[PDB]
Design a protein around this ligand. Structure first.
Ligand SMILES: Nc1ncnc2c1ncn2[C@@H]1O[C@H](COP(=O)(O)O)[C@@H](O)[C@H]1O
Ligand SMILES: Nc1ncnc2c1ncn2[C@@H]1O[C@H](COP(=O)(O)O)[C@@H](O)[C@H]1O
Ligand SMILES: Nc1ncnc2c1ncn2[C@@H]1O[C@H](COP(=O)(O)O)[C@@H](O)[C@H]1O
Lengths: 104, 104, 104
């Protein structure tokens, strides 16, 4: 019935640093603006600089958030990166102590 | 019977950098001192600097660890952050090769 | 039948920075070269510098990847770190939009 089967998901993307601006805009547009960003490096297949974007979601289908990130991060060249979806079992809002999907 | 249903959990917190000291103390007090820290930035709702604290736990209830972090990280102002709990299926101690919940 | 029960896994290692070179080589040798690296700090049991290595895998058994990392990261001294395995529910290749285990 509910998005994400009434649960919580972590959308974790590794993308090109120069695409972060467009990804932020895409996340806002899809209604899930919250995100955490980490400077990382990697290789697919000397490491290349990338950025990790993490969005924990509940109200918004994880697949919709992943699509929004992927569309904005895309260039068509090797090195564009990947998005992964992981399960999250609980969430706690530090300011209030509120827990569960409504804390996300 | 066992804490965390006899399994392993990742407690992942995104908090204010200035609260890391108190969070370290709280983690020690609750008996789960091990942690990994990452410099990150984010927004909720220009990114703001935050810190990610990760604690993989087995012997200590994940909820107790989350509460300890949340209490120490709290200020009452927007920007205090969030704690998320994710499942961990296995753990390996590099020094010994020991595996399972006892490796955590 | 398939590796990882036909699913996807995240292998997340926290190791000594000076072992990253040997870990990269070990990952290539085991046939799972892709990785993402993060500068982190931590304590087990003043934080010490460590490196986080993340490998999302499907075709290669997660346990085999963990063993490869652990062998290369090992020194025998306290501080060698840990490897954790987490479930991943989906993967998307940004360049192509391809999804599922074949996107990993
Ligand atoms: N299977 C994987 N596991 C971990 N990180 C990955 C994986 N695939 C891609 N990455 C990250 O995403 C970046 C771009 O991937 P790619 O477009 O496949 O070359 C890499 O440099 C890594 O940082
Ligand atoms: N749903 C979320 N997903 C990812 N990161 C989040 C989320 N909510 C909060 N954060 C992180 O936590 C910080 C503080 O959150 P807040 O107190 O909600 O403004 C943000 O700047 C982000 O780094
Ligand atoms: N249970 C844990 N949760 C989170 N990080 C850990 C844990 N155990 C070890 N670490 C990380 O791994 C590093 C080395 O661990 P150790 O060899 O146990 O002292 C620490 O400094 C932390 O960064």
């Amino acid at each position: 019935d509910l998005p994400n089967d009434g649960g919580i998901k972590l959308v974790m993307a590794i993308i090109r640093p120069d695409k972060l601006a467009d990804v932020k805009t895409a996340l806002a547009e899809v209604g899930a603006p919250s995100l955490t960003v980490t400077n990382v490096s990697g290789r697919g297949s000397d490491l290349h600089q990338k950025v990790k974007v993490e969005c924990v979601v509940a109200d918004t289908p994880a697949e919709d958030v992943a699509d929004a990130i992927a569309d904005a991060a895309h260039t068509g060249e090797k090195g564009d990166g990947k998005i992964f979806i992981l399960p999250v079992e609980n969430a706690i809002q530090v300011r209030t102590g509120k827990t569960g999907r409504d804390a996300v």
